[PDB]
Amino acid sequence: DYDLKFGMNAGTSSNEYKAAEMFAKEVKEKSQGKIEISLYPSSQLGDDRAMLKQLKDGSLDFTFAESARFQLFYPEAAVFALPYVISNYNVAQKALFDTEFGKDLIKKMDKDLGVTLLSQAYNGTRQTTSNRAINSIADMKGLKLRVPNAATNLAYAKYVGASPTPMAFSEVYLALQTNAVDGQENPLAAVQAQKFYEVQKFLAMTNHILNDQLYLVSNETYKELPEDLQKVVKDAAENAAKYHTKLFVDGEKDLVTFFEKQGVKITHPDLVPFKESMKPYYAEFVKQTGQKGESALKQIEAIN
Numbered sequence: 001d002y003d004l005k006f007g008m009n010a011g012t013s014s015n016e017y018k019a020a021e022m023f024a025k026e027v028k029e030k031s032q033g034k035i036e037i038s039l040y041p042s043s044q045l046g047d048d049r050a051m052l053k054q055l056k057d058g059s060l061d062f063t064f065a066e067s068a069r070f071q072l073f074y075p076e077a078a079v080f081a082l083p084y085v086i087s088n089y090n091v092a093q094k095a096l097f098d099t100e101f102g103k104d105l106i107k108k109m110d111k112d113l114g115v116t117l118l119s120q121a122y123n124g125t126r127q128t129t130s131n132r133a134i135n136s137i138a139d140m141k142g143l144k145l146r147v148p149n150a151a152t153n154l155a156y157a158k159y160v161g162a163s164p165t166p167m168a169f170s171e172v173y174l175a176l177q178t179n180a181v182d183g184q185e186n187p188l189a190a191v192q193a194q195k196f197y198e199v200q201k202f203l204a205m206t207n208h209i210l211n212d213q214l215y216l217v218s219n220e221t222y223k224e225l226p227e228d229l230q231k232v233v234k235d236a237a238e239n240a241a242k243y244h245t246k247l248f249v250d251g252e253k254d255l256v257t258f259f260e261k262q263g264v265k266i267t268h269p270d271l272v273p274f275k276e277s278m279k280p281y282y283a284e285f286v287k288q289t290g291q292k293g294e295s296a297l298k299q300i301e302a303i304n
């Protein structure tokens, strides 16, 4: 029998975990018991980068990773988290699987990083909560928008006309409550997790950054497996991914609905001038990441 480990940063109550449970179920049934995958949630084995390294050395069998996270190896890969570059999840898939940039990055993942990409999932979009309504981009002006201390997030707050306000995540509730800070952005699960709906009366569907999740196997594991058991593992991660995606899609819907119950009001501002405002940031991406950057941007922009 094959005794396989699967690590991930997410927790037992997460969509990522519920879905890896499925993947593990199916690999056990359909390998007629030969393979069995244990779960190591909550960064138990290290952070993402350590788990990625462990996939390369073969000491961890599976792990999760966003596609933007690969910019640690290839800087042009941060294209995936550039604000308004990935309009939707259909863009994230065609970007990864149906472009020369993305086809090639999967080939790099393998050749350089010892990692086989089995499947991709949707892991949620970042949206914007505030003490007052965002009906358009003209509302962004004046807002103390809390972002984490990450270039793409600050570039979002900055270029839309907001006032970016990095602060520690645990300080964010009271900052919002006492209106020291006006809004924040983050996936909807954080809004709920951190109770921001209590201190934020408005939620804007700003669709500004989108997160994905890759089902990754160690090359040392995958190719030591027999051809039939490889396909069992691959099929199961394509099934698990479709589920994972549907968990996030369906749960985002229910969370909008939940928030409305809490007295939050939702807006759907026009995002054409939001993405127009980013062109200065894109210029700076292509400057830093050069020719590889420019074609990634242009090939992904060329999508739907």
Ligand SMILES: [Zn+2]
Pocket: 001, 002, 003
């Ligand atoms: Zn065993």
